[PDB]
């Protein structure tokens, strides 16, 4: 939900991302969960990227009379990801993963009329992972890993139609019966609508952990409980080498999950797995714009949001170079309308998704995988404005997986 990304493998995009504390048939879901790396016996690659195609529209009219439609608001974006897993000993192993799991990008024209919370938005953020795990005995296993997030921003946002709206205020109040108030209703009138009132762009790293726990009743069938922390980020706006002769501030903090996943391989061309996935952030969505020696300060307010995502996937094993799978899944995000932002889709979403694997041989294999995402229809109450957005999305993604040391 919200500036959340699942998309941290090619084969999870095939199940709708359903159960993936509990399914390791590549090196992927160590990223999901740590504790995962004791199902591995060898080390293990893999690499590929999600192409994310949303479709998000604007809609409304302004209490001005101008409209606030705007349509595809949300740029297509590639989400790469990257994986390592091995063992260290019988009891010990260790992996690293560069994914993202959250990000955003909006942008309206410089002269829409809802530009003072419409403007551009772009969050990108990439995940650092090193996790390690211990495995118990033949049930149980933990594992622990390190987050280190970078993060870039950009914000804009504009006068939009506010100056309008000051004017009609003032020539509504008896201020507007007088010479004076009707020169100060001009002014406020004649404000460009493109004129830039507010500004970030800054590139931060934050820090965070996550941890899971592997319970396996046999080779078949497995559950798991995974955390991932809240990451802070903040924001802050030679010589040499001449041979002797980043601007704005804002604090975001990355939301917490819990997720608990299964995995029930009930045949052997057969598997299913499902999820239910819990996420709270610590800030709401609208931001608010002061400033300090011109520089802005962006703030959220500090409040209680969740969501949770349920999800639930099969995966067909044919034969041994043929996977296929799919799945559903939905992710709900209860925000009152007037606590959204329409700089940031958030609608309750729908998937379907549907996937193959070939595998070359027992070292290599590639994944293919598909979703579609139908976002509900919402409105929103921001500022002095009413709007009602729409959205939906086509994912797309392929991923390689290598594991070393064929021998035989
Ligand atoms: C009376 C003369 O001052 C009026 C102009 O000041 C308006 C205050 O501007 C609001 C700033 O925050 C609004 C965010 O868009
Ligand atoms: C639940 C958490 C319990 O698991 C702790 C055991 O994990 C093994 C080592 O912890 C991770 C160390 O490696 C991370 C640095 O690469
Ligand atoms: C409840 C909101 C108050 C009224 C809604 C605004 C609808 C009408 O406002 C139109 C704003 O246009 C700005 C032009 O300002 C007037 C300038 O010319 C008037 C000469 O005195
Ligand atoms: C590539 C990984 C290397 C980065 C590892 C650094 C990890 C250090 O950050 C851990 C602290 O993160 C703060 C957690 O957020 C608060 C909740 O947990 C705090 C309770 O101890
Ligand atoms: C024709 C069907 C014969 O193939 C049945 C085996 O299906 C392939 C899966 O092989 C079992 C081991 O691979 C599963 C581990 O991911
Ligand atoms: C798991 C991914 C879903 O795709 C499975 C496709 O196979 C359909 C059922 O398997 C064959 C049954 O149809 C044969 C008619 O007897
Ligand atoms: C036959 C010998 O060539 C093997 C080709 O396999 C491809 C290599 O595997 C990918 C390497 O990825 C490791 C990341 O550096
Ligand atoms: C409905 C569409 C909304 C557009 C923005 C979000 C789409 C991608 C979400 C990815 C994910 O939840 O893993
Ligand atoms: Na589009
Ligand atoms: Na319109
Ligand atoms: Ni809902
Ligand atoms: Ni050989």
Same mark, same amino acid.
């Given at each position: 939900a919200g500036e959340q990304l699942n998309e941290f493998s090619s084969s999870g995009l095939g199940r709708a991302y359903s159960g993936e504390g509990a399914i390791?048939?590549?090196?992927?879901?160590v990223s999901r969960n740590?504790?995962?790396?004791?199902?591995?016996d060898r080390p293990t690659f893999s690499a590929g990227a999600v192409y994310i195609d949303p479709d998000v529209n604007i809609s409304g009219t302004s209490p001005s009379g101008r409209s606030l439609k705007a349509d595809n608001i949300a740029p297509t974006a590639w989400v790469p990801n990257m994986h390592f897993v091995a063992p260290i000993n019988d009891q010990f192993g260790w992996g690293a993963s560069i994914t993202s799991n959250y990000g955003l990008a909006t942008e309206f024209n /410089?002269?829409?009329?809802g530009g003072s919370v419409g403007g551009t938005t772009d969050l990108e953020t990439m995940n650092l992972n090193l996790s390690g795990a211990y495995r118990l005995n033949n049930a149980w296993s933990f594992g622990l890993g390190f987050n280190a997030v970078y993060a870039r921003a950009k914000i804009e946002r504009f006068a939009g139609d506010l100056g309008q709206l000051v004017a009609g205020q003032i020539m509504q109040?008896?201020?507007?019966?007088?010479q004076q108030g009707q020169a100060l209703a001009a002014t406020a009138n004649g404000? /460009?609508?493109?004129?830039?009132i507010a500004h970030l762009n800054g590139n931060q790293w934050g820090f965070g952990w996550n941890a899971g726990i592997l319970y396996e009743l046999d080779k078949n069938n497995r559950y798991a409980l995974t955390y991932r922390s809240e990451v802070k980020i903040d924001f802050k706006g030679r010589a040499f080498n001449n041979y002797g002769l980043q601007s704005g501030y804002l604090t975001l903090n990355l939301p917490e999950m819990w997720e608990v996943s299964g995995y029930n391989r009930v045949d052997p061309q057969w598997a299913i797995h499902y999820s239910l996935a819990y996420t709270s952030w610590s800030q709401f969505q609208q931001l608010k714009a002061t400033s300090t020696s011109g520089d802005t300060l962006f703030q959220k307010h500090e409040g209680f949001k969740d969501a949770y995502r349920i999800a639930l996937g099969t995966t067909y094993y044919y034969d041994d170079n043929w996977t296929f799978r799919t799945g559903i899944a939905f992710d709900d995000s209860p925000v009152p309308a007037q606590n959204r932002s329409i700089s940031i889709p958030d609608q309750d979403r729908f998937w379907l998704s549907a996937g193959t694997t070939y595998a070359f041989n027992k070292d290599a294999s590639v994944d293919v995988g598909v979703s579609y995402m139908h976002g509900q229809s919402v409105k929103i109450n921001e500022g002095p404005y009413q709007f009602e957005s729409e959205g939906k999305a086509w994912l797309f993604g392929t991923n390689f997986n290598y594991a070393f040391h064929h021998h035989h």
């Open positions: 390791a048939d590549d090196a992927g879901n740590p504790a995962l790396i004791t199902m591995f /410089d002269t829409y009329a109040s008896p201020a507007g019966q007088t404000i /460009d609508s493109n004129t830039k």
